[PDB]
A paper describes a structure:
Astroviruses are nonenveloped, positive-sense, single-stranded RNA viruses that belong to the Astroviridae family and are named after their ‘star-like’ appearance when observed by electron microscopy (EM). ORF1a and 1b encode non-structural polyproteins, while ORF2 encodes the viral capsid structural protein that is the target for host antibodies. The capsid core domain forms the icosahedral shell around the virus genome, whereas the capsid spike domain is thought to be responsible for the attachment and entry of the virus. The capsid spike domain is the primary target of serum antibodies, is the target of all known neutralizing monoclonal antibodies, and is being evaluated as a subunit vaccine antigen.
Porcine astrovirus 4 (PoAstV4) has been recently associated with respiratory disease in pigs. Therefore, we could not determine the spike domain boundaries based on sequence alignment alone, and instead determined the spike domain boundaries by predicting the structure of the full PoAstV4 capsid protein using AlphaFold2. We then designed a PoAstV4 spike construct containing residues 420 to 655 from the full-length capsid protein of PoAstV4. Size exclusion chromatography showed purified PoAstV4 spike protein eluted at the approximate size of a homodimer, which suggests that the recombinant protein is folded correctly. To further substantiate the folding of the recombinant PoAstV4 spike, we used X-ray crystallography to determine the structure of the PoAstV4 spike to 1.85 Å resolution. A trimmed AlphaFold2 model was used for molecular replacement. Structural alignment of the crystal structure of the PoAstV4 spike dimer with an AlphaFold2 predicted model using TM-align reveals an RMSD of 0.72 Å and a TM alignment score of 0.886, whereas an alignment with an AlphaFold3 predicted model reveals an RMSD of 0.49 Å and a TM alignment score of 0.992, demonstrating the accuracy of these structure prediction programs and improvements from AlphaFold2 to AlphaFold3. The PoAstV4 capsid spike crystal structure reveals a homodimeric protein formed of mainly beta-strands, similar to other animal and human astrovirus capsid spikes, and consistent with in-solution studies with size-exclusion chromatography. Interface analysis using the PDBePISA server reveals 4660 Å buried at the dimer interface, with 64–65 interacting residues in each chain. Compared to other experimentally solved astrovirus spike structures, the PoAstV4 spike has the highest structural similarity to murine astrovirus (MuAstV), as seen visually with a notable beta sheet cleft at the top of both spikes and by their high TM alignment score of 0.809.
Numbering used by the authors:
A (entry chain C), B (entry chain B): 425 to 490, 494 to 654
Write the structure that this text describes.
């Protein structure tokens, strides 16, 4: 595996999860990941710049760009490649109400405006594990994580800028979803039902740190290379 | 300036702030930072182990051990050294209600049980910038940070184990406090008043990520060397 880190931009949002499919509905415009040699697809609105990443393997800084699979945009009925994925990692978060989180590291190969827009009927929800300060009695606090699920919305049309050569994170998450496909052993999940916006706390996992689903201090990303 | 990152242990709490002083009251047992050329001191119960840290300076992994100042424990009236500080950084988060935050990287020089015990009268409060998913209408969410302040408590006696050779983070924070002293340029602030548990949101800063006051994705700590 590759350990990944980078300074964040001023006010740059943290990684999060989005869903945009209910029944047969799909978003009008979104970031798409289709399986190699397959027609299956998942969607996302997650697009996070890595301002200046650093890649580390087995304690040594390496150059990832010295077997990739592309990442597309869906723009209406028109899919188009926007970059290539170098590493990805998946993990199941939770027990009786699992959240499947797939993070992919990719480098844009075109400097373009990426349109995001949900289906006209509200279908778009967003997921985040918000770190909380937990106190039981008069002891040292710990960090718990709650699952924040936004209410259903129809994502207003918007333009997001990507630049050739830059690195980007993109999650593909699902709430109690199905195994749609996998790419080089990394599964990709999809859920098709509205998510109850009332959710409890989720026990932390060391893989949720690796995929970036739960924030922690000085904790780098850690994904599998395409192999 | 050194970038630091590390994988977190299973469920390891994220960096938080602690205050333990009101008026002339000081904790019974806590981690102490003394001015290199003075008798001034600040206190904390923050003590977070870095499982397997990596230090990066100007793009390259470095061995930071090849001018340090000690970090002590206060145990009753007794003070004793427990480690040596290799890097530190300071920043203020907020305008009308500022929070002074100093993070110090240090390596333990003894393996023993460190005593934490607040004053008998409640004096201990803890502070955390909890990352939140905020949504304005039907648009992409952002990450805001609220200021979680625990209620006044008297920290129950406890023992925290440290091991010589391991790396530990420790914060020294204040809520609209005074600059007690500085160690190799990095100021250390102290607050001597109970903190109102009702607080608002704090706008992001790049320094908050570097010192680790606000969590972000794949974002390392970045502290100054001792010079
Ligand atoms: Ca002693």
């Amino acid at each position: 595996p590759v350990q990944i880190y980078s300074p964040s931009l001023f006010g740059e949002p943290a990684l999060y999860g989005s869903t945009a499919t209910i029944g047969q509905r799909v978003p009008v415009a979104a970031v798409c990941m289709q399986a190699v040699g397959g027609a299956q697809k998942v969607y996302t609105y997650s697009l996070r710049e890595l301002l200046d990443p650093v890649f580390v393997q087995n304690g040594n800084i390496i150059d990832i760009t010295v077997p990739t699979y592309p990442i597309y945009q869906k723009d209406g009925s028109d899919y188009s490649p926007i970059g290539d994925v170098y590493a990805a990692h998946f993990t199941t978060i939770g027990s009786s109400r699992p959240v499947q989180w797939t993070t992919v590291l990719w480098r844009a190969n075109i400097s373009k405006q990426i349109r995001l827009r949900g289906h006209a009927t509200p279908t778009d929800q967003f997921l985040f594990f918000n770190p909380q300060l937990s106190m039981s009695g008069s002891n040292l606090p710990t960090t718990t994580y709650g699952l924040t699920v936004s209410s259903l919305v129809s994502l207003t049309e918007r333009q997001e800028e990507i630049n050739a050569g830059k690195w980007y994170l993109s999650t593909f998450v699902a709430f109690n979803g199905r195994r749609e496909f996998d790419n080089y052993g990394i599964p990709f999940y999809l859920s098709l039902q509205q998510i109850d916006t009332q959710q409890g706390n989720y026990e932390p996992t060391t893989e949720a740190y690796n995929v970036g689903a739960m924030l922690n201090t000085a904790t780098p990303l850690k994904l599998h290379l395409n192999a």
